[PDB]
Every structure is written in C-alpha cells, then in structure tokens.
Amino acid sequence: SVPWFPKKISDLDHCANRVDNVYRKRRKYFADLAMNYKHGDPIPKVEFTEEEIKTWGTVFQELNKLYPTHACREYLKNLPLLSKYCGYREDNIPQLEDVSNFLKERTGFSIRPVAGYLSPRDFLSGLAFRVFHCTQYVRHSSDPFYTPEPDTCHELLGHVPLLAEPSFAQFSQEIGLASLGASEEAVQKLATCYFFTVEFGLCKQDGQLRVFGAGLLSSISELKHALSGHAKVKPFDPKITCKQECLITTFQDVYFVSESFEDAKEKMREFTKTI
Numbered sequence: 001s002v003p004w005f006p007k008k009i010s011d012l013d014h015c016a017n018r019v020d021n022v023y024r025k026r027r028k029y030f031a032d033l034a035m036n037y038k039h040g041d042p043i044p045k046v047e048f049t050e051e052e053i054k055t056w057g058t059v060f061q062e063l064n065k066l067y068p069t070h071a072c073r074e075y076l077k078n079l080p081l082l083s084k085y086c087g088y089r090e091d092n093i094p095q096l097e098d099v100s101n102f103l104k105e106r107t108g109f110s111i112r113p114v115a116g117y118l119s120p121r122d123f124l125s126g127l128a129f130r131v132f133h134c135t136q137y138v139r140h141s142s143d144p145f146y147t148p149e150p151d152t153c154h155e156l157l158g159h160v161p162l163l164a165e166p167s168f169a170q171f172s173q174e175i176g177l178a179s180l181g182a183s184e185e186a187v188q189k190l191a192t193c194y195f196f197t198v199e200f201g202l203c204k205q206d207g208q209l210r211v212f213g214a215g216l217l218s219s220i221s222e223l224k225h226a227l228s229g230h231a232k233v234k235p236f237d238p239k240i241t242c243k244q245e246c247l248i249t250t251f252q253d254v255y256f257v258s259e260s261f262e263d264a265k266e267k268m269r270e271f272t273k274t275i
C-alpha cells in the first residue's frame with residue numbers, strides 16, 4: 001500500500017516536525033519557533049545576536065571572494081538580486097520571511113522554518129509543492145568554514161540563490177514530485193540524486209567546472225576543495241549517481257558533474273520512470 005504523502009501545500013504541517021550553555025538555549029529557541037509554525041503563518045522575524053551576525057559576516061565575506069571563480073553563472077546572476085531586495089549584507093542576516101516572499105515572486109518557491117533534519121521523504125515532499133524547509137539558526141562561531149549540519153547560512157547562501165532560478169526551481173520540484181508516495185527504495189535513490197546535484201553538484205559551463213551544490217556554496221573550505229583538482233569527479237548519471245554513499249561531517253569523496261540544470265532535469269525524468 002501507499003504511505004501517506006501531502007496532497008496540498010498546507011498538508012506539510014503534518015510532516016515538518018520530525019527529528020556551551022548559551023548556545024543550547026539559543027538552539028532550542030529556534031527549534032521552538034519552527035515547531036510551532038503552521039502553513040500560512042508569516043515566518044517569525046528573528047533578532048540575531050552580534051556573534052551570530054559576525055559569524056554570518058565572516059562566512060558571507062569570504063565566500064563572496066570565491067563565488068566569481070567557483071559559482072555557476074546562475075548563482076552569480078541571482079545573488080545580487082538577493083542583496084538588493086532581501087538585505088544580504090556582512091552586517092545583516094536576511095530574514096527567512098523576506099527571502100521566502102522573494103522566491104514567491106521569482107519561482108513560486110516558499111520557505112518553511114524547520115527545527116532540524118527531516119526524513120528524505122518528508123523533505124522531498126515539500127519540494128513537490130515548491131516549499132523548501134530551512135533552518136533558522138546560525139552555525140557555532142568555532143568553525144565558520146564548515147559545519148556538520150545545515151544552518152541559516154547554508155540555506156540563505158547555498159540554496160536560496162538557485163531556487164530563484166526557474167530552470168533550477170523546476171528541477172527541484174520534479175525531484176519532489178517524483179518522491180510523492182514513492183517506494184522507500186525510490187525515495188532514497190531520489191534523495192541521493194538530490195544530494196549530488198542540489199546539495200553537492202558540479203556543472204560544466206563554457207568548458208569550466210562550476211559549483212551549484214548548496215552544501216558546497218555555503219562552505220568556504222569545501223568550495224575550494226571541490227574545484228581544487230584534488231577531488232574525484234564523475235559525470236552525473238542517475239542510475240550510477242544514486243548508488244553513491246552520502247557522507248556527513250566530512251567532505252564528499254566524489255562529485256558529480258551535470259551538463260546543465262535542464263540536462264540534470266531530463267536525466268532525472270528518464271530515471272524516475274525506471275523506479
């Protein structure tokens with residue numbers, strides 16, 4: 001029989017809640033905000049602390065040094081749009097509500113604040129309705145270069161700029177749409193393909209390797225590592241790519257290169273029929 005899946009955007013209420021002293025209370029605070037959030041609510045505006053803003057400022061400042069030579073053209077295209085409309089600055093952390101409103105005008109995507117990791121099924125189910133579950137907290141100040149879990153920096157600098165791109169927006173949703181009510185095996189295959197594209201993908205533009213992986217675009221160290229030449233590279237092929245192990249708390253052992261977003265989209269459409 002078919003497992004439960006959302007049939008409308010508001011149904012995501014039923015799946016979004018899955019799962020240093022001052023930092024812990026701060027983290028619980030953000031978790032509480034996401035937990036009590038219901039569809040239709042404005043995403044609660046948060047006054048970030050200076051340490052959090054300085055952390056964002058450090059990551060943001062350093063990544064912007066790398067983006068022109070590392071990021072794909074679409075990322076570099078939409079990133080200034082975010083700084084002109086959503087307050088992307090070194091001294092200011094953008095609000096999830098504002099960028100969500102921006103995405104609505106651009107690609108119809110929206111943001112939903114989430115406490116932490118959701119199951120791949122629940123997360124991909126959100127994409128089916130062009131909803132991206134975002135963490136609202138900032139990474140610990142100890143290591144701004146890399147963090148073993150998503151933070152608001154990862155969402156805002158990694159995911160948001162490409163979600164504003166129609167071709168990429170379509171690609172993301174179709175992965176989500178494919179996931180709806182799919183078998184456990186199918187969801188995991190889709191989740192792995194999502195992982196090595198949306199989160200850690202590489203693309204070929206004008207003969208050059210560029211980064212569109214969100215997990216890469218928000219990590220100072222791995223972004224450099226991905227294009228250094230010391231990394232393992234393979235062509236994106238869903239049947240093969242979906243068999244690759246997804247690593248956490250570390251750099252990936254291999255990266256997959258797509259020809260383009262529409263190319264990645266077409267390869268996925270072919271693949272989802274097989275499963």
Ligand SMILES: Cc1ccn(-c2cc(Cl)ccc2[C@@H](Oc2cc(-c3ccc(C[C@H](N)C(=O)O)cc3)nc(N)n2)C(F)(F)F)n1
Binds near residue numbers: 119120148215246
């Ligand atoms: C098959 C499949 C697909 C997904 N999953 C899965 C399921 C659950 Cl419930 C938990 C964990 C995972 C996967 O882990 C991650 C991690 C991240 C991630 C991205 C960026 C950053 C910040 C960056 N390092 C920075 O420094 O900015 C952090 C984390 N993103 C995703 N989508 N998955 C895992 F475990 F498979 F790898 N499984």
Ligand SMILES: [Fe+3]
Binds near residue numbers: 154
């Ligand atoms: Fe992510």
